Structure 1
Amino acid sequence: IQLEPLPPLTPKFLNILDQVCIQCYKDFSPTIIEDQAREHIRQNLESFIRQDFPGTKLSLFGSSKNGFGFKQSDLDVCMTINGLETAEGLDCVRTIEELARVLRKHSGLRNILPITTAKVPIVKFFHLRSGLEVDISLYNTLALHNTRLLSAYSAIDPRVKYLCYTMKVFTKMCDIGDASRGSLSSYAYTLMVLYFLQQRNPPVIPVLQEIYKGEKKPEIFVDGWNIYFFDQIDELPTYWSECGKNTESVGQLWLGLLRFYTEEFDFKEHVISIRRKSLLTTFKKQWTSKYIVIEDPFDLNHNLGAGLSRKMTNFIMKAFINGRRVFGIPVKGFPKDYPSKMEYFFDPDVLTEGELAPNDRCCRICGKIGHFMKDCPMR
């Protein structure tokens, strides 16, 4: 597939692109009050569950803590039991079902649903007063660490946040950010942003998992994987020589990302991997089955794109190509004929050409993957 050449931009248009990326953050990030409410929910659930399971500990992870949350993002909760370091004596499937029974007694919750067949078994439910979806998992230790990792990256430079928010808006508007419906997890798209910023010349962020006081990388193992990374961001100028050398604006970088993954990045040859600056090949990983290949920074056996079908991969790539056109090619009558720039750049009828995301892997009743119709909740 060949792509349209991009016309040269004016500074006036470049400033518009900058503003759109920043509005994605300002418009959709939670207020300080909404963040505190999320902590209050965790606190309330921990006390309620402790009535039946004393020593329960609930810990927030995901976008509530990694610096990239939206107002209506779900509440990702990790449950552990004090004194029990790992889930090696804990019966996780039976624990999920016991936990669900406890949560059905909570008058402020609705629609308790345990999902024990997923790779990560969860019990999810609806919190009435906040209107948020909550997902509780058991001993999700690695998720807690990649939450800290992403949070560290978000603190290095404000542009990290702006781009991750813009990416999250983009994929959400294209309806390609729901792994439960066959597309990619929003966490996978966050990794794509970070990988782009690491490979940029000059880089906007370093590879924190490769920064350390010499000579060798410290070895801190969790569930068989080294979770070390440099998290002393205040001292980063000392340990990152290229700190602050990239002076591109946010809009420049956002258009650069769209061009990077449509023109430059070789999906069939390389793996999107934020744990190392050196390119990682699909052949070295023996991950040639799929086109989009995304390696988790800690669980190196996890390919985030392992679930994508061929159709979904084409749909995703067409979205990025159309995004390249909308953000890169100024149009006549813009911006004076449009009372909202957000509605122009993120128009789904343009980015996906009016088509809906494919859903062939999905249940015909609810639209989720991973269950037969006799097991559907909406039956």
Structure 2
Amino acid sequence: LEPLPPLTPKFLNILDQVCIQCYKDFSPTIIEDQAREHIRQNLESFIRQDFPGTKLSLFGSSKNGFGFKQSDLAVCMTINGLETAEGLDCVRTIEELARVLRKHSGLRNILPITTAKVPIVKFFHLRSGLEVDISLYNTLALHNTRLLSAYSAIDPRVKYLCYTMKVFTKMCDIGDASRGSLSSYAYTLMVLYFLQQRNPPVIPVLQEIYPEIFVDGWNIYFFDQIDELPTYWSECGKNTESVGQLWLGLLRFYTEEFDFKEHVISIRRKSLLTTFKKQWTSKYIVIEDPFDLNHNLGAGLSRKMTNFIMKAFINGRRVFGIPVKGFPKDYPSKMEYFFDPDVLTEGELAPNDRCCRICGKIGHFMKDCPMR
């Protein structure tokens, strides 16, 4: 890789400011968050007309501390008194739920997706302009939402970096697993793993600070008493790198240092995890879910998509690491300079060979495409 020049405090200050602006510009207002809670309440009352005892819980980026304006609304549906879906017919329930939702005058384009690993019914909410996705007894997602939320509360730099990673991957168009790339959840795990492995670490491994609490066959314990963390985490407050330093460090870490072919991105343990012991040697980008240890978040990546993703990060390393003549005085927007897709992806679009030629999503043949 191209060697990076030495930097100056003024350029470092610019990097710090850009990362913090990613958070300030794209995090929802408190009013926008309250509206998501109101939608949850409305949907729950409506569904209760046909299915009394229905409970809707928000999860994902709406609740884990890293949500964007206009992010989809991730909803987990359960039934009061029924502990698990062990006795619930999930696919038939998704279809029954879809029919009920077609009677809601404020929703459009109900679409049940019953063939996905996690079946969902998704739809468009007219008044908010938001897409909604309802899943059934998605219990582990509730817990990794709580896990990510706790990490976001340890240090403001966690939020700043996760928002910067989110902007970067969305601008490169590599943050949608329904199109064959990686989920934003997966990229957030990459940020947390980088921060855990930093010397000194910015965050601890909460699942290794303390018990066995099992859900769907997996231990979901983690240390969530963040206000008491200085007592149980010896290295607390040791890392004093600025956000901009950490962002460039992340780009260099995953282009220069991290051995994708040898190691797994795993935030459940501080000790390095090898693909060999995991038997996950078929893929290049290997990311382990913190709870569902059989889930490799990179299992869907093709070779072309992997090359595209790595090329994006290599170009980001260059743009954020090599100052340019005329910057910042000839550029009225630092955001447009650093996150220019024509530079980061060199004008190319993300590969879509696995995607339906009609709608651009994976997972279905053309006769079952909604946009036909």
Fold equivalence (TM over 0.5)? yes
Q: Aligned partners of 1:102, 1:282: CA distance in 2, in Å?
A: 45
Q: CA deviation at 1:29?
A: 0.2
1:249, distance to aligned residue in structure 2 (A): 0.2
Deviation at 1:19, TM superposition (A): 0.2
Cα deviation for residue 11 of structure 1 reads 0.2
Q: CA deviation at 1:323?
A: 0.2
Query: In 2, Cα distance between the equivalents of 1:323 and 1:114?
Result: 37
Aligned equivalents of 2:258, 2:135: Cα separation in 1: 34
Shift of 1:330: 0.1
Q: For residue 219 of structure 1, report the CA deviation from its aligned partner.
A: 0.3
Aligned-partner SS, 2:76: strand
Q: Distance in 2 between matches of 1:114 and 1:120?
A: 11
Match of 1:181 in 2: 179
Q: Do residues 246 (structure 1) and 244 (structure 2) align?
A: no
- State how far apart, in whole Å, the 2-side matches of 1:32 and 1:96 are: 31
What is the DSSP-based 3-state SS (H/G/I as helix, E as strand, rest coil) of the residue aligned with 2:280? coil
Three-state SS of the structure 1 residue aligned to 2:244 is helix
| Displacement after TM superposition at 1:201 (Å) | 0.2
Q: What's the CA shift for 1:228? A: 0.1
Q: Distance in 2 between matches of 1:331 and 1:182?
A: 34
> 2:365 maps to what in 1?
372
Kindly state the Cα deviation for residue 169 of structure 1 after the two structures are TM-superposed.
Answer: 0.2
CA distance in 2, matches of 1:288, 1:365: 33
Secondary structure of 2:124's aligned partner? strand
Task: Determine the C-alpha separation between the residues in 2 that align with 1:195 and 1:133.
Answer: 30
DSSP 3-state at the match of 1:88: helix
The structural deviation recorded for 1:25 is 0.1
Displacement after TM superposition at 1:194 (Å):
0.1
Structure 1 residue 22: Cα displacement = 0.1
1:106 CA drift (Å): 0.3
Does residue 85 of the first structure (1) align with residue 83 of the second (2)? yes
**Any idea what the Cα deviations from partners look like across 1:38-95, whole Å, max 9, x if unmatched?**
0000000000000000000000000000000001100000000000000011000000
Query: 1:139 corresponds to which residue?
Result: 137
Tell me how far apart the structure 2 counterparts of residues 36 and 347 of structure 1 sit (CA, whole Å).
32
Partners of 1:345 and 1:181 in 2: CA distance: 25
CA distance in 2, matches of 1:199, 1:133: 35
Instruction: Report the Cα distance in structure 1 between the residues aligned to 2:105 and 2:195, rounded to whole angstroms.
Output: 45
What is the RMSD computed on CA atoms of the aligned residues? 0.2
Mapped to 1, the partners of 2:216 and 2:72 lie a distance apart of 25
Could you report, residue by residue, the CA deviation over 1:4-30 in whole angstroms, capped at 9, with x for unpaired residues? 000000000000000000000000000
1-side partners of 2:69 and 2:257: how far apart?
A: 33
Deviation at residue 259 of structure 1 after TM alignment: 0.1
| Aligned mates of 2:256, 2:278 — CA distance in 1 | 23
- Secondary structure class of the residue paired with 1:123: strand
4+ aligned runs moved over 3 Å, structure 1: none
Residue 164 of structure 1, CA deviation: 0.1
Deviation at 1:357, TM superposition (A): 0.2
Gaps of 5+ in 1: 213-217
Q: CA deviation at 1:368?
A: 0.2
- Separation of aligned partners in 1, 2:180 and 2:193: 22
Q: Output the TM-score relative to the length of structure 1.
A: 0.98
Q: State the TM-score, normalized to the length of structure 2.
A: 1.00
How many Å separate the matches in 2 of 1:73 and 1:200?
A: 29
Length, aligned pairs only: 372
Measured after TM superposition, the shift of residue 225 of structure 1 is 0.1
Q: How far apart, in 2, do the equivalents of 1:163 and 1:132 lie?
A: 25
C-alpha distance in 2 between matches for 1:242 and 1:78? 36
> Deviation string for 1:312-362 (max 9, x for gaps)?
000000000000000000000100000000000000000000000000000
Which residue pairs with 1:202 in the alignment? Answer: 200
**1:198: how far off?**
0.1
- Tell me the SS of whatever aligns to 2:153: helix
DSSP 3-state at the match of 1:114:
strand
Cα deviation code 1:247-303 (max 9, x no counterpart): 000000000000000000000000000000000000000000000000000000000
1:103: how far off?
0.3
For 1:88 and 1:249, the matched residues in 2 are separated by: 47
CA distance in 2, matches of 1:157, 1:108: 39
In the aligned structure 2, how far is the partner of 1:231 from the partner of 1:362?
40
Question: Following the alignment from structure 2 to structure 1, what is the Cα–Cα distance between the partners of residues 105 and 236?
Answer: 51
Equivalence for 1:58: 56
Residue 354 (structure 2) pairs with residue 361 (structure 1): yes
Alpha-carbon distance between aligned partners in 1 of 2:283 and 2:74, rounded to the nearest angstrom: 28
Partner Cα distance (1:169, 1:296) in 2: 22
> CA deviation digits over 1:118-148, x for unaligned, max 9?
0000000000000001000000000000000
Q: Distance in 2 between matches of 1:40 and 1:234?
A: 29
- Look up the SS of the partner of 1:367 in the other structure: coil
Distance 1:178 1:189 in 2: 11
